[PDB]
Amino acid sequence: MYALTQGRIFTGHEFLDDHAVVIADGLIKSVCPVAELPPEIEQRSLNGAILSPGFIDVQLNGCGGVQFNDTAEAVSVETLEIMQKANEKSGCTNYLPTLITTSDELMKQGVRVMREYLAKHPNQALGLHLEGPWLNLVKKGTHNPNFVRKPDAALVDFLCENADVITKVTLAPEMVPAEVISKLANAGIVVSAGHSNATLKEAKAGFRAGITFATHLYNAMPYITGREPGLAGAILDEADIYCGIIADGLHVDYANIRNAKRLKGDKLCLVTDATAPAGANIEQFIFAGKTIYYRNGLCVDENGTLSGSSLTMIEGVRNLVEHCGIALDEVLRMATLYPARAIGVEKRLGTLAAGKVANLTAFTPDFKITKTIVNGNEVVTQ
Amino acid sequence: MYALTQGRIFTGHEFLDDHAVVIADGLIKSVCPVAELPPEIEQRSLNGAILSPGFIDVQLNGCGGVQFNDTAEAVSVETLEIMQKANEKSGCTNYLPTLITTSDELMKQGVRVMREYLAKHPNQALGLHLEGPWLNLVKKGTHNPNFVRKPDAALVDFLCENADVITKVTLAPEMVPAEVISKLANAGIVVSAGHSNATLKEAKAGFRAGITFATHLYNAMPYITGREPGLAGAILDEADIYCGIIADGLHVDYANIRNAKRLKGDKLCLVTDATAPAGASGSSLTMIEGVRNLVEHCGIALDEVLRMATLYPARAIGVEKRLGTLAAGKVANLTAFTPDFKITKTIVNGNEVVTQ
Ligand SMILES: [Zn+2]
Ligand SMILES: [Zn+2]
């Protein structure tokens, strides 16, 4: 047992000064004023850094130089181990390894690997985020067009049967029967609308069937016209729909993010949707059979096509703060509480409270990580 | 003088249930509890209708079978008079006749005609709304590409010289020098961005040069995309920018209007952008219809909807000192309607011109 002290603490609901967070047995024992601590308890100074719950990234394809995609060799427990350690250096203690449209074979392999990972590393990579393959070719992005396909009943049932390791599935509502959505949803899986060219009507039909989330707002969605709001327009006007947004300033112009935050309120979650180069130092990487060069801090292919993100959660936090006029506290919620409630793990992860898992991170005013704690153990010290 | 009583009174800032409005000498003399009314003044019952400042439509090309466009015969004081009477029936007491991109000659005639109308009719058609010709062909909509053109010193100066009868000018910011925008604005003209394919950056440059309004949001503008906000995204993100929106459920999906109202706050104005058919594609919206649509389909409170049709447009074009609210000294232009949005009474300069 020990307690973090001497620094601003963000519980997820407010900032506390002259307070302490007592951690013991991998959980947060309590939050109290530094005054109510028995002098003999081990005290670890924050050195004036802001303490926050660990960041939760609900959409991440890869980082730390690797990717949980494409090959059978990549889709492995070690990739998840490498990805986890990379995120931690960025204050991200939890994430959803995201596997994009590929073969049923690789999909089934992902499930086994995730399950294998869960049996070794607790409260870290929470579960699978299957992005695809039931998408719309027109908004396929970088996905392999050969794997974009209609949903097979058997594959659908397979997913429901394995909902215990599948946190979320992104599909194009106008490309799937309502039943599939309702099926996956009733199985306990978060169904999100994305890589879709759905009209407003199709989007709303997608929500009524059970979709409760939207993947990277504005990206791989119809443009917004006066007469046809499209899926993005629809997500904006639907109060209860949660949605992620990539805040690197490249995928979404900051004005669009500010507009989205005003309309989404407490339903907008920060995501990185990052790839291999994030939290690493590589020149390029392969994906969907294409070479994505990491040229000038940008992931672009030979055509000049922006083909990926290298954002990290602290960076996203920093950008939302200084470029989008969102106060730090609300931004912190966008990286913890909100995504936690969006995937249903707020019972134990989105905030700093008694009984919650001891996953935290600390950073200085200039947004530099100084600490990352996982299951009570300090894994990052800078 | 007379007093309007027995009905809900919306001043522009609040509803009053047991009050009255006294009209005299074409002005609103006072708003007071019915029990404070001078016993001598004639009392006229609203019969339970809702009384409100007269609607102000800042973008109208035609109505009542006529149009203030195209021909030298149409751009006339008579057309303006016909449009006014037709507007009065749908609760609209003020409007900006809108002349779309055409020749310099027709523009000059429009200006002359507006001045002659003004010397004869006060507090009615307020001033000219010149939509074009400095537009972007990509977003010319129904505008004649042959007349869409760049601004030349001569035209610019003529408009500035006639700022007093020209209320607004719609232009594509990315198609004109910043100096042209500032020239118009400094002359007192409301410069509005419209029929533009402007990027967010070009839109912002326009605002800094003096643009303070945007014509029919979402229409004849770049479609919004994550990486390309365009003029529309910029307007939504710019708090000080006023803008009109067509609420017929056809030009703009109601969902976009809701997203728009939430981001624009008190800067969103209801407009019809109506044409000939309105009175008796294109728009045939009337202001009272737009009010009904906004309330029943956009989840906006009636009082806020009523402001979108009076106070806001009034402030957008700088006539709030005499119009837009039911308060002492303001011009007596009002309209009354039943809860189901049927006009029962319209008053202009204190005179009841509509009785139903
Ligand atoms: Zn995607
Ligand atoms: Zn127009």
XYZ file of C-alpha atoms and ligand atoms in Angstrom:
740
model
C 0.000 0.000 0.000
C 1.017 3.619 -0.655
C -0.466 7.009 -1.522
C 0.181 9.530 -4.305
C 0.480 13.092 -3.037
C 1.633 16.664 -3.643
C -0.072 17.542 -6.909
C -3.400 18.292 -8.597
C -5.626 15.236 -8.716
C -8.386 14.707 -11.274
C -10.941 12.150 -10.137
C -12.864 12.470 -13.370
C -15.470 14.717 -11.767
C -13.273 17.463 -10.295
C -9.773 18.744 -9.513
C -8.521 18.311 -5.936
C -5.621 20.194 -4.373
C -3.694 19.073 -1.280
C -5.230 15.625 -1.633
C -3.952 12.078 -1.972
C -4.815 8.839 -3.741
C -4.179 5.721 -1.695
C -3.472 2.617 -3.733
C -3.339 -0.954 -2.457
C -3.877 -4.431 -3.927
C -4.058 -3.151 -7.499
C -7.054 -1.010 -6.641
C -7.631 2.545 -5.499
C -8.300 2.361 -1.769
C -9.539 5.933 -1.405
C -9.141 9.606 -2.259
C -8.647 11.949 0.669
C -6.958 15.150 1.846
C -3.239 14.612 2.477
C -4.109 15.554 6.062
C -6.124 12.381 6.719
C -3.179 10.080 5.986
C -1.466 8.123 8.780
C 2.132 9.514 8.851
C 3.548 6.003 8.414
C 1.992 5.314 4.990
C 4.439 5.369 2.094
C 3.990 8.677 0.292
C 4.969 9.139 -3.340
C 5.108 12.712 -4.576
C 3.534 13.805 -7.862
C 6.011 16.657 -7.820
C 3.243 19.033 -8.865
C 1.955 16.980 -11.787
C -1.690 16.374 -12.640
C -2.858 12.894 -11.620
C -5.548 11.330 -13.813
C -7.163 7.958 -14.474
C -5.245 6.068 -17.170
C -6.232 7.032 -20.713
C -8.594 4.673 -22.552
C -8.191 4.468 -26.347
C -11.195 2.668 -27.911
C -9.715 2.620 -31.425
C -6.064 1.700 -32.001
C -4.677 -0.327 -34.903
C -1.073 -0.380 -33.810
C 1.778 1.479 -32.149
C 5.243 0.838 -30.739
C 6.332 -0.158 -34.217
C 3.874 -3.016 -34.654
C 0.275 -3.554 -35.734
C -2.462 -5.960 -34.704
C -3.510 -6.338 -38.355
C -2.973 -7.941 -41.767
C -0.760 -10.969 -41.116
C -1.238 -14.021 -38.924
C 2.258 -13.307 -37.636
C 1.265 -9.825 -36.432
C -2.012 -10.840 -34.781
C -0.391 -12.191 -31.618
C -0.178 -11.742 -27.865
C 3.287 -10.176 -28.066
C 2.050 -7.464 -30.452
C -0.541 -6.623 -27.789
C 2.232 -6.653 -25.178
C 4.348 -4.285 -27.250
C 1.339 -2.072 -28.003
C 0.475 -1.906 -24.282
C 3.974 -0.802 -23.237
C 3.993 1.835 -25.957
C 0.632 3.300 -24.901
C 1.771 3.453 -21.286
C 4.571 5.853 -22.252
C 1.710 8.042 -23.488
C -0.448 7.741 -20.380
C -2.769 5.220 -22.019
C -3.299 2.241 -19.726
C -6.183 0.617 -21.590
C -7.164 0.156 -25.206
C -9.029 -1.882 -27.765
C -6.705 -3.600 -30.234
C -8.493 -2.872 -33.494
C -8.502 -5.514 -36.248
C -9.711 -4.233 -39.619
C -11.555 -6.099 -42.375
C -9.732 -9.307 -43.154
C -10.489 -13.027 -43.528
C -12.700 -14.983 -41.154
C -9.506 -16.920 -40.473
C -7.579 -13.906 -39.216
C -10.706 -12.725 -37.373
C -11.029 -16.048 -35.571
C -7.303 -15.921 -34.824
C -7.743 -12.462 -33.320
C -10.416 -13.755 -30.968
C -8.216 -16.610 -29.733
C -5.228 -14.304 -29.255
C -7.289 -11.693 -27.405
C -8.650 -14.432 -25.161
C -5.096 -15.688 -24.686
C -3.901 -12.178 -23.855
C -6.729 -11.668 -21.349
C -5.573 -14.803 -19.510
C -2.169 -13.251 -18.893
C -2.490 -9.448 -18.761
C -5.449 -8.085 -16.767
C -6.955 -4.586 -16.976
C -4.910 -3.559 -20.002
C -5.975 -4.313 -23.580
C -9.650 -4.718 -22.642
C -10.978 -6.490 -25.689
C -11.293 -6.645 -29.434
C -12.562 -3.872 -31.650
C -13.464 -5.424 -34.981
C -13.545 -2.644 -37.583
C -15.097 -4.235 -40.635
C -15.564 -6.194 -42.830
C -19.267 -5.366 -43.185
C -18.488 -1.936 -44.599
C -19.408 0.211 -47.579
C -16.834 0.063 -50.396
C -17.313 3.796 -51.010
C -16.045 4.630 -47.521
C -13.595 1.727 -47.152
C -10.665 4.021 -46.507
C -7.458 1.998 -46.535
C -9.202 -1.363 -46.062
C -8.488 -4.226 -48.472
C -11.425 -4.005 -50.920
C -11.254 -7.779 -51.396
C -12.307 -8.442 -47.808
C -15.067 -5.851 -47.636
C -18.141 -8.085 -47.794
C -21.687 -8.808 -46.631
C -22.218 -10.440 -43.204
C -22.529 -14.234 -43.155
C -25.067 -15.460 -40.606
C -22.594 -18.039 -39.266
C -19.866 -15.412 -38.782
C -22.386 -13.194 -37.005
C -23.345 -15.979 -34.610
C -19.664 -16.687 -34.109
C -19.124 -13.131 -32.880
C -22.083 -13.224 -30.488
C -20.861 -16.590 -29.153
C -17.501 -14.940 -28.470
C -18.792 -11.640 -27.115
C -16.710 -12.212 -23.975
C -13.566 -10.986 -25.751
C -15.170 -8.717 -28.354
C -15.816 -5.240 -26.984
C -16.964 -3.514 -30.153
C -17.749 -4.031 -33.825
C -17.841 -1.260 -36.412
C -20.126 -1.845 -39.362
C -21.888 0.223 -42.023
C -25.584 0.247 -41.012
C -26.809 0.556 -44.616
C -24.770 -2.567 -45.510
C -26.156 -4.868 -42.817
C -29.572 -6.256 -41.821
C -30.983 -4.732 -38.644
C -31.052 -8.239 -37.151
C -27.264 -8.469 -37.222
C -26.978 -5.247 -35.227
C -29.649 -6.365 -32.772
C -27.959 -9.788 -32.577
C -24.499 -8.387 -31.777
C -26.006 -5.781 -29.454
C -28.042 -8.316 -27.460
C -24.882 -10.401 -27.182
C -23.443 -7.487 -25.194
C -21.229 -6.119 -27.951
C -21.026 -2.389 -28.645
C -22.050 -1.865 -32.251
C -20.683 1.263 -33.870
C -21.513 2.930 -37.188
C -18.497 3.660 -39.389
C -16.967 3.429 -42.875
C -20.502 3.977 -44.053
C -22.200 6.126 -46.673
C -25.460 5.893 -44.750
C -28.101 8.574 -45.240
C -29.715 10.158 -42.153
C -32.640 7.748 -42.395
C -30.301 4.755 -42.658
C -28.273 6.052 -39.695
C -31.311 6.449 -37.445
C -32.490 2.992 -38.506
C -29.045 1.813 -37.447
C -29.458 3.374 -34.002
C -32.909 1.940 -33.351
C -31.565 -1.551 -34.112
C -28.941 -1.099 -31.400
C -25.988 0.963 -32.614
C -24.814 3.148 -29.744
C -21.439 4.342 -30.983
C -19.867 5.849 -34.111
C -16.308 5.327 -35.261
C -14.027 8.328 -35.844
C -16.626 10.990 -36.568
C -16.326 12.676 -39.977
C -13.846 10.074 -41.263
C -15.097 7.480 -43.757
C -18.571 9.077 -43.623
C -20.677 11.023 -46.140
C -19.968 14.735 -46.478
C -22.710 16.908 -44.974
C -25.108 18.607 -47.401
C -28.042 20.878 -46.618
C -30.567 18.287 -47.795
C -28.786 15.109 -46.672
C -27.133 15.260 -43.230
C -25.796 11.754 -43.750
C -24.440 9.616 -40.875
C -22.198 12.370 -39.460
C -25.090 14.832 -39.500
C -27.204 12.137 -37.850
C -24.669 11.314 -35.130
C -24.454 15.035 -34.290
C -28.225 15.352 -33.829
C -28.583 12.145 -31.740
C -27.998 12.950 -28.056
C -27.427 9.397 -26.818
C -24.910 8.238 -29.400
C -21.305 8.073 -28.227
C -18.590 8.606 -30.833
C -14.827 8.809 -31.113
C -12.945 11.564 -32.885
C -9.291 11.612 -33.968
C -7.682 14.797 -32.619
C -4.338 15.045 -34.461
C -5.411 18.109 -36.437
C -4.975 16.213 -39.706
C -7.956 13.857 -39.908
C -10.409 16.402 -38.575
C -10.001 20.153 -38.839
C -10.152 21.580 -35.305
C -13.200 23.713 -36.163
C -15.057 20.472 -36.902
C -13.984 19.098 -33.535
C -15.186 22.195 -31.661
C -18.494 22.004 -33.529
C -18.772 18.294 -32.609
C -17.984 18.863 -28.925
C -20.710 21.508 -28.653
C -23.260 19.135 -30.221
C -22.096 15.883 -28.562
C -21.596 17.208 -25.040
C -20.421 14.382 -22.751
C -20.641 11.817 -25.567
C -17.464 12.714 -27.491
C -14.479 10.427 -26.819
C -10.859 11.074 -27.770
C -9.330 8.225 -29.808
C -6.048 7.991 -31.713
C -6.949 5.378 -34.331
C -3.148 5.237 -34.443
C -0.824 2.875 -36.296
C 2.713 1.434 -36.037
C 4.656 4.747 -36.083
C 2.872 6.054 -32.959
C 5.180 5.909 -29.956
C 7.957 4.568 -32.155
C 10.490 5.560 -34.781
C 9.820 3.854 -38.091
C 10.060 4.922 -41.723
C 7.029 3.048 -43.024
C 4.809 0.029 -42.521
C 2.634 -2.253 -44.620
C -1.156 -2.444 -44.375
C -3.984 -3.894 -46.468
C -1.233 -4.804 -48.924
C -0.078 -1.186 -49.210
C 3.053 0.651 -48.121
C 2.299 3.520 -45.776
C 5.326 5.789 -45.527
C 5.609 7.804 -42.327
C 6.819 10.927 -44.135
C 6.934 14.288 -42.337
C 5.032 13.134 -39.257
C 2.263 12.011 -41.615
C 1.134 8.538 -42.675
C 0.738 8.714 -46.467
C 0.986 6.204 -49.293
C 2.641 6.821 -52.681
C -0.465 8.610 -54.007
C -0.343 11.209 -51.242
C -3.336 9.572 -49.561
C -3.442 10.162 -45.795
C -3.500 6.500 -44.707
C -3.275 6.451 -40.925
C -2.679 8.159 -37.600
C 0.330 8.384 -35.297
C -1.464 10.255 -32.487
C -0.991 9.327 -28.824
C -3.582 9.991 -26.134
C -1.473 12.645 -24.323
C -1.007 14.420 -27.641
C -4.720 14.205 -28.325
C -5.317 15.616 -24.857
C -2.831 18.392 -25.490
C -4.359 19.253 -28.874
C -7.956 19.314 -27.617
C -6.799 21.696 -24.910
C -4.793 24.208 -26.922
C -6.482 24.065 -30.338
C -10.126 23.316 -29.543
C -10.834 25.565 -26.583
C -11.976 22.687 -24.372
C -11.011 22.988 -20.697
C -8.493 20.434 -19.418
C -10.969 18.732 -17.097
C -13.529 18.089 -19.836
C -10.696 16.928 -22.115
C -9.505 14.477 -19.456
C -13.038 13.058 -19.302
C -12.950 12.679 -23.093
C -9.953 10.352 -22.585
C -11.220 8.399 -19.586
C -14.738 8.634 -18.150
C -16.530 9.034 -21.487
C -14.931 6.178 -23.403
C -15.218 4.036 -20.271
C -18.962 4.639 -20.110
C -19.167 4.148 -23.870
C -17.773 0.614 -23.647
C -19.394 -0.268 -20.328
C -16.305 -0.523 -18.112
C -17.015 2.594 -16.039
C -17.842 0.284 -13.161
C -14.107 -0.125 -12.682
C -11.979 2.132 -14.923
C -13.081 5.634 -15.945
C -12.436 7.480 -12.688
C -10.316 7.736 -9.543
C -12.520 6.224 -6.844
C -12.587 3.598 -4.101
C -12.712 0.100 -5.509
C -11.748 1.126 -9.036
C -8.716 -0.469 -10.679
C -5.490 1.399 -9.943
C -4.778 2.528 -13.517
C -3.502 6.102 -13.555
C -1.121 8.505 -15.247
C 0.527 11.788 -14.280
C 1.774 14.615 -16.453
C 3.213 18.100 -16.117
C 1.608 21.380 -17.279
C 3.333 21.043 -20.651
C 1.682 17.630 -21.101
C 4.704 15.419 -20.470
C 4.037 12.020 -18.897
C 5.818 11.515 -15.571
C 4.021 8.388 -14.355
C 1.805 5.543 -15.513
C 0.362 3.033 -13.091
C -1.192 -0.299 -14.045
C -2.863 -2.487 -11.420
C -1.132 -0.373 -8.794
C 2.350 -0.900 -10.226
C 4.236 2.119 -11.514
C 5.371 1.097 -14.992
C 6.396 4.525 -16.270
C 8.654 6.992 -14.476
C 10.016 10.049 -16.270
C -54.653 55.657 -30.542
C -55.813 52.200 -29.555
C -54.717 49.264 -27.429
C -54.341 45.601 -28.348
C -55.608 43.318 -25.584
C -56.794 39.858 -24.565
C -54.022 37.692 -25.972
C -50.489 36.479 -25.304
C -48.029 39.278 -26.050
C -44.479 38.371 -27.134
C -42.218 41.405 -26.822
C -39.177 39.753 -28.333
C -37.801 39.049 -24.851
C -40.786 37.492 -23.035
C -44.471 36.532 -23.160
C -47.073 38.626 -21.314
C -50.472 37.159 -20.490
C -52.663 39.898 -19.070
C -51.205 42.954 -20.739
C -51.775 45.162 -23.740
C -49.916 47.166 -26.361
C -50.924 50.772 -27.043
C -50.368 52.072 -30.550
C -50.302 55.729 -31.495
C -48.741 57.763 -34.278
C -47.416 54.601 -35.906
C -45.377 53.710 -32.819
C -45.612 51.375 -29.849
C -46.516 53.838 -27.096
C -46.327 51.320 -24.271
C -46.809 47.742 -23.129
C -48.660 47.423 -19.846
C -50.976 45.363 -17.627
C -54.486 45.664 -19.066
C -55.620 47.161 -15.735
C -53.331 50.161 -16.270
C -54.733 51.118 -19.666
C -56.167 54.634 -19.839
C -59.964 54.207 -19.703
C -60.437 56.393 -22.807
C -58.308 54.450 -25.304
C -60.131 52.105 -27.659
C -59.417 48.456 -26.855
C -59.099 45.878 -29.632
C -59.269 42.210 -28.695
C -56.683 39.796 -30.086
C -59.294 37.175 -29.302
C -56.679 34.938 -27.718
C -54.129 35.194 -30.529
C -50.396 35.562 -29.977
C -49.133 39.072 -30.713
C -45.578 39.523 -31.986
C -43.335 42.076 -33.687
C -43.851 41.835 -37.462
C -41.718 39.221 -39.217
C -38.588 40.398 -41.024
C -37.445 38.365 -44.042
C -33.883 39.303 -45.036
C -33.921 37.258 -48.269
C -36.854 37.298 -50.687
C -36.727 37.287 -54.498
C -40.457 37.305 -55.071
C -43.962 36.518 -53.842
C -47.559 37.452 -54.556
C -47.119 36.545 -58.212
C -44.276 38.983 -58.899
C -40.476 39.009 -58.705
C -37.964 41.787 -58.142
C -35.667 40.324 -60.816
C -34.867 39.751 -64.497
C -36.886 42.373 -66.375
C -36.749 46.161 -66.314
C -40.505 46.028 -65.883
C -40.316 43.798 -62.801
C -37.665 45.796 -60.934
C -40.142 48.508 -59.978
C -41.705 50.215 -56.987
C -45.014 48.540 -57.839
C -43.464 45.085 -57.514
C -42.118 46.096 -54.107
C -45.594 47.251 -53.066
C -47.147 44.015 -54.285
C -44.542 41.972 -52.428
C -45.219 43.926 -49.206
C -48.971 43.297 -49.238
C -48.389 39.630 -50.029
C -45.906 39.358 -47.122
C -48.309 41.062 -44.745
C -50.752 38.155 -45.218
C -48.187 35.697 -43.842
C -47.283 37.999 -40.968
C -44.235 39.558 -42.659
C -44.082 43.364 -42.366
C -40.520 43.978 -43.479
C -38.245 42.438 -46.069
C -35.218 42.927 -48.248
C -36.055 42.669 -51.942
C -33.330 40.454 -53.350
C -31.823 41.178 -56.773
C -29.723 38.249 -58.038
C -26.649 38.564 -60.258
C -27.499 40.474 -63.413
C -26.056 43.352 -65.481
C -24.640 46.534 -63.978
C -27.525 48.423 -65.596
C -30.235 46.356 -63.926
C -28.377 46.682 -60.626
C -28.399 50.481 -60.970
C -32.096 50.452 -61.807
C -32.752 48.327 -58.728
C -30.935 50.894 -56.587
C -32.904 53.770 -58.138
C -36.185 51.948 -57.652
C -35.352 51.085 -54.031
C -34.701 54.753 -53.293
C -37.975 55.861 -54.906
C -39.867 53.184 -52.961
C -38.201 54.315 -49.748
C -39.227 57.963 -50.179
C -42.836 56.811 -50.448
C -43.060 53.835 -48.072
C -41.460 53.888 -44.631
C -40.787 50.877 -42.404
C -41.706 48.287 -45.014
C -39.253 47.015 -47.645
C -36.116 48.143 -45.784
C -33.442 48.011 -48.449
C -31.833 46.146 -51.315
C -30.323 42.706 -50.958
C -27.973 42.254 -53.928
C -27.211 38.538 -54.192
C -24.356 38.392 -56.657
C -22.697 38.904 -59.096
C -19.337 38.258 -57.380
C -20.078 34.567 -56.863
C -18.315 31.270 -57.438
C -19.472 29.385 -60.544
C -19.091 26.141 -58.572
C -21.921 27.389 -56.368
C -23.839 29.678 -58.719
C -26.932 27.588 -58.108
C -29.574 28.983 -60.430
C -27.494 32.120 -61.109
C -26.659 33.019 -64.704
C -22.986 32.045 -65.238
C -22.793 34.723 -67.914
C -23.333 37.416 -65.307
C -21.260 35.840 -62.521
C -18.117 37.998 -62.537
C -15.298 39.720 -60.636
C -15.795 43.124 -58.977
C -14.564 46.257 -60.752
C -13.806 49.578 -59.054
C -16.728 51.267 -60.816
C -19.410 48.905 -59.507
C -17.846 48.744 -56.070
C -17.882 52.525 -55.713
C -21.448 52.817 -57.013
C -22.687 50.443 -54.307
C -20.689 52.227 -51.587
C -22.027 55.555 -52.843
C -25.548 54.130 -52.493
C -25.034 52.331 -49.192
C -28.084 54.101 -47.780
C -30.536 52.066 -49.899
C -28.486 48.871 -50.053
C -28.883 46.853 -46.876
C -26.881 43.804 -47.851
C -24.645 42.282 -50.490
C -24.026 38.553 -50.842
C -20.679 37.650 -52.389
C -18.223 34.743 -52.487
C -15.332 35.820 -50.210
C -12.740 33.764 -52.088
C -13.745 35.569 -55.304
C -13.149 39.185 -54.269
C -10.241 41.158 -52.755
C -10.414 41.780 -48.999
C -10.396 45.496 -49.817
C -13.738 45.179 -51.637
C -15.337 43.560 -48.582
C -13.976 46.236 -46.248
C -15.071 49.009 -48.612
C -18.681 47.790 -48.586
C -18.674 47.159 -44.820
C -17.170 50.539 -43.929
C -19.900 52.145 -46.042
C -22.420 50.551 -43.711
C -23.430 47.692 -45.979
C -23.896 44.230 -44.503
C -21.537 41.950 -46.406
C -22.703 38.336 -46.452
C -20.901 35.184 -47.611
C -22.928 33.037 -50.027
C -22.864 31.037 -53.281
C -19.291 30.425 -52.235
C -16.982 27.398 -52.413
C -14.723 29.054 -49.833
C -12.453 26.929 -47.664
C -12.578 27.473 -43.906
C -9.435 29.603 -44.222
C -10.900 31.740 -47.043
C -14.113 32.115 -45.077
C -12.224 33.380 -42.026
C -10.342 35.889 -44.176
C -13.717 37.123 -45.352
C -14.951 37.608 -41.791
C -11.822 39.571 -40.837
C -12.319 41.835 -43.847
C -15.862 42.652 -42.720
C -18.285 39.850 -43.573
C -20.816 39.567 -40.722
C -23.598 37.488 -42.278
C -23.988 34.281 -44.314
C -26.679 33.608 -46.931
C -28.915 30.546 -46.547
C -26.627 28.311 -44.507
C -25.760 24.957 -46.124
C -27.163 26.003 -49.518
C -24.721 26.896 -52.294
C -21.794 26.248 -49.939
C -19.152 23.513 -49.756
C -20.415 20.303 -48.174
C -18.838 19.794 -44.757
C -16.152 17.096 -44.489
C -13.775 16.230 -41.672
C -10.797 17.701 -43.494
C -12.714 20.339 -45.449
C -15.036 22.287 -43.091
C -15.647 24.779 -45.877
C -17.633 28.000 -45.489
C -20.491 26.254 -43.678
C -18.264 24.695 -40.998
C -16.614 28.084 -40.496
C -19.946 29.842 -39.980
C -20.987 27.243 -37.415
C -17.690 27.717 -35.552
C -17.784 31.531 -35.736
C -19.888 32.915 -32.883
C -20.221 36.480 -34.164
C -21.480 35.525 -37.592
C -25.206 35.913 -38.253
C -26.795 33.752 -40.923
C -30.107 32.989 -42.563
C -31.542 29.514 -42.997
C -34.489 28.356 -45.136
C -36.905 26.319 -43.019
C -39.251 24.614 -45.486
C -38.030 21.111 -44.676
C -36.849 20.924 -48.288
C -33.757 23.152 -48.717
C -32.321 22.054 -45.367
C -33.086 18.846 -43.510
C -34.546 19.704 -40.129
C -31.685 17.801 -38.457
C -29.196 20.259 -39.973
C -31.321 23.149 -38.716
C -31.245 21.688 -35.199
C -27.463 21.173 -35.339
C -27.244 24.746 -36.691
C -29.419 26.387 -34.043
C -27.410 24.739 -31.282
C -24.135 26.068 -32.664
C -25.412 29.479 -33.783
C -27.406 30.396 -30.685
C -28.818 33.902 -31.176
C -27.215 34.402 -34.597
C -29.524 32.143 -36.632
C -32.162 33.916 -38.744
C -35.229 32.473 -40.434
C -35.598 33.485 -44.105
C -37.782 32.279 -46.946
C -35.674 33.023 -50.023
C -39.121 32.743 -51.603
C -40.181 33.364 -55.192
C -43.316 34.411 -57.119
C -45.506 31.445 -55.996
C -45.046 32.191 -52.263
C -47.664 34.931 -52.184
C -50.381 33.270 -54.258
C -37.323 23.988 -57.773
C -37.217 27.171 -55.697
C -38.743 28.169 -52.344
C -42.379 29.100 -51.675
C -41.961 29.430 -47.895
C -43.744 32.263 -46.060
C -42.480 33.523 -42.703
C -45.436 32.237 -40.683
C -44.921 28.783 -42.225
C -41.225 28.856 -41.321
C -42.149 29.685 -37.750
C -44.536 26.751 -37.578
C -41.994 24.366 -39.099
C -39.231 25.448 -36.730
C -41.454 24.882 -33.722
C -42.986 21.579 -34.746
C -40.005 19.899 -36.384
C -36.849 21.454 -34.940
C -37.527 21.318 -31.216
C -37.048 25.064 -30.800
C -39.223 26.963 -28.305
C -41.824 29.316 -29.829
C -40.345 32.409 -28.187
C -36.880 31.590 -29.569
C -38.398 30.784 -32.967
C -40.197 34.147 -32.905
C -36.839 35.845 -32.179
C -35.313 34.039 -35.194
C -37.995 35.837 -37.236
C -37.759 39.304 -35.692
C -35.107 40.393 -33.190
C -32.193 38.453 -34.711
C -32.735 39.467 -38.359
C -33.336 43.011 -37.088
C -30.004 43.017 -35.263
C -28.305 41.292 -38.181
C -29.093 44.221 -40.472
C -28.944 46.971 -37.861
C -32.569 48.091 -37.627
C -33.155 46.926 -34.067
C -33.519 50.501 -32.813
C -36.904 50.778 -34.516
C -37.907 47.175 -35.219
C -37.614 43.647 -33.871
C -39.294 44.196 -30.489
C -42.570 45.346 -28.943
C -41.345 48.210 -26.746
C -42.051 51.938 -26.318
C -40.841 54.057 -29.219
C -40.359 51.174 -31.647
C -42.227 51.222 -34.964
C -45.731 49.747 -34.763
C -45.306 46.753 -37.086
C -46.819 43.617 -35.590
C -48.660 40.446 -36.485
C -50.954 38.128 -34.553
C -51.638 34.449 -35.012
C -53.670 31.670 -33.425
C -51.833 28.804 -31.669
C -52.156 26.780 -34.884
C -50.233 29.518 -36.733
C -53.000 31.200 -38.726
C -52.516 34.946 -39.173
C -55.362 36.890 -37.594
C -53.913 40.372 -37.767
C -51.032 42.309 -39.346
C -50.226 45.938 -38.556
C -47.854 48.295 -40.371
C -46.951 51.740 -39.048
C -49.833 51.334 -36.626
C -52.321 50.467 -39.357
C -54.087 47.118 -39.419
C -53.611 45.906 -42.990
C -54.671 42.325 -42.315
C -57.755 41.119 -40.480
C -58.682 37.431 -40.390
Zn -11.609 3.336 -39.735
Zn -28.987 32.097 -53.160
